[PDB]
Structures are given as structure tokens and as C-alpha cells.
């Protein structure tokens, strides 16, 4: 089976760990969720801050965490389940009242050569919240504090904030920062935390969060 859709294809019904092996890849251990929508693969997962995700590149190109914790899937895994085609990406937020947040997206992601860029199409990047996205859509590379793909020579948003995201600007989202329990005294602090700015705020450190994705 390539990926978790395939498991829930040929009729498993558990949510749990699963040996997947995407075409040219070695196998691997995954998070499928299976739902009424199929099967989803966990690419990332974060609720209690146990695990540091402020890595360089390497690490996040091959994952790392706690499986049955929290964890980064690895980007070169993500795009061996993805390869070039459509795919859909869930992000699931909970903000500490308990209140959730389910959004989806159609997606393509890039291999290492595009910095694993997430590619849109104008519309989709409109419900993200882009009103200056020409038609052909928009690509925005991944980035870390030692890989770090802004433009400005004096810019490193990865370095700035933490973790590694799709930073396209510095201020949209990024679940993969410093894990938080309340306010902190610095305002450079709740800067680097786990934030979708279009739920929660900009300064809103998000108490949970779970991103999956399903090939086609």
C-alpha cells in the first residue's frame, strides 16, 4: 500500500500506525487516520510542547519526534506519498477554550529541488487570504533558520521566529513554532509561537494542532 487513502481502500477501518511504501520509496511507519472522507496520512502533530521542533533542514526533510507523540512526518516522506499529484491537506487547530478548527486545501507540494514548495492555485491562495496572487496561482518554498529561502539578505523569518514552515510572509501562520502554555513577558516571544493568524490572531499561541494530507 503507498499510502494510508490505499489502506482505507482495501478496507482498513483503525486509525494507528501503518507500514506504507509510496512508489521508488523504501517503507516507512505512518499515522493514518481513517474517516468518513477515507484515509489521511498525519504529516504533523503537536499538542503538550514535549517535543523541540526549532531543527535545521535535514531534520526537517526527514522527520523527527515521537510517534505515538508529537512529531514532524519528514517533507521528503510527505512528497514521496504526494509526488507531483493534487493533493488535499487538512490542518486541524484547537485554541485552549477547546474550541477546533477544521480547514482544507488542495495542494501540490514540490520535491527537494523547489525547497518542498507548497504550490496554489489563485484560488485556494485567495482562501487562504491572498488578494495578490496573479492567476497562475503562487509557490511558496519551506524554510529554516539554516536554510532559509527570503528574499531580503538581512531576513531570516525561520531565525526570527522558530521552527521550520512555509514562511511566505512572516505573519500567516506557522504551526511548528515554540510551543507556549500562557503569555510570556517578551513580545519577541509569543512571535515565535504556534499561530494561524486568520483563526486565533497573530499573537495566539494555539493549544493543539494536527496537518494530514491525501494524495488526489
Same mark, same amino acid.
Given at each position: 500500500?503507498? #499510502? ?26 505512518? %499515522? ?10 498525519v504529516?504533523q502533530r503537536r499538542h503538550d510542547g514535549s517535543v523541540d521542533f %526549532? ?10 519526534g515521537d510517534?505515538?507523540g508529537e512529531f514532524w ?10 509526488? #507531483?499529484? %493534487? ?5 486541524q487547530l484547537r485554541?485552549?477554550?477547546? %474550541? ?45 533558520? #539554516? ?6 539578505? #538581512? ?8 521552527g ?10 506557522n504551526l511548528n513554532g515554540q510551543y ?13 509561537g504556534i ?10 499561541p494555539l493549544q493543539a494542532t494536527t496537518m ?5
Amino acid at each position: 500500500p503507498r #499510502d494510508c487513502q490505499e489502506l482505507f481502500q482495501v478496507g482498513e477501518r483503525q486509525s494507528g500506525l501503518f507500514e506504507i511504501q509510496p512508489q521508488g520509496s523504501p517503507p516507512f511507519l505512518v %499515522n493514518c487516520k481513517m474517516t468518513s472522507d477515507g484515509g489521511w496520512t498525519v504529516i504533523q502533530r503537536r499538542h503538550d510542547g514535549s517535543v523541540d521542533f %526549532n531543527r535545521p533542514w535535514e531534520a526537517y526533510k526527514a522527520g523527527f519526534g515521537d510517534p505515538h507523540g508529537e512529531f514532524w512526518l519528514g517533507l521528503e516522506k510527505v512528497h514521496s506519498i504526494t509526488g #507531483d499529484r %493534487n493533493s488535499r491537506l487538512a490542518v486541524q487547530l484547537r485554541d485552549w477554550d477547546g %474550541n477546533a478548527e477544521l480547514l482544507q486545501f488542495s495542494v501540490h507540494l514540490g520535491g527537494e529541488d523547489t525547497a518542498y514548495s507548497l504550490q496554489l492555485t489563485a484560488p485556494v491562495a485567495g482562501q487562504l487570504g491572498a488578494t495578490t496572487v496573479p492567476p497562475s496561482g503562487l509557490s511558496v518554498p519551506f524554510s529554516t533558520w #539554516d536554510q532559509d529561502h527570503d528574499l531580503r539578505r #538581512d531576513k531570516n523569518c525561520a531565525k526570527s521566529l522558530s521552527g521550520g514552515w512555509w514562511f511566505g510572509t512572516c505573519s500567516h501562520s506557522n504551526l511548528n513554532g515554540q510551543y507556549f502554555r500562557s503569555i510570556p513577558q517578551q513580545r519577541q516571544k509569543l512571535k515565535k509561537g504556534i499561530f494561524w493568524k486568520t483563526w486565533r490572531g497573530r499573537y495566539y499561541p494555539l493549544q493543539a494542532t494536527t496537518m494530514l494530507i491525501q494524495p488526489m
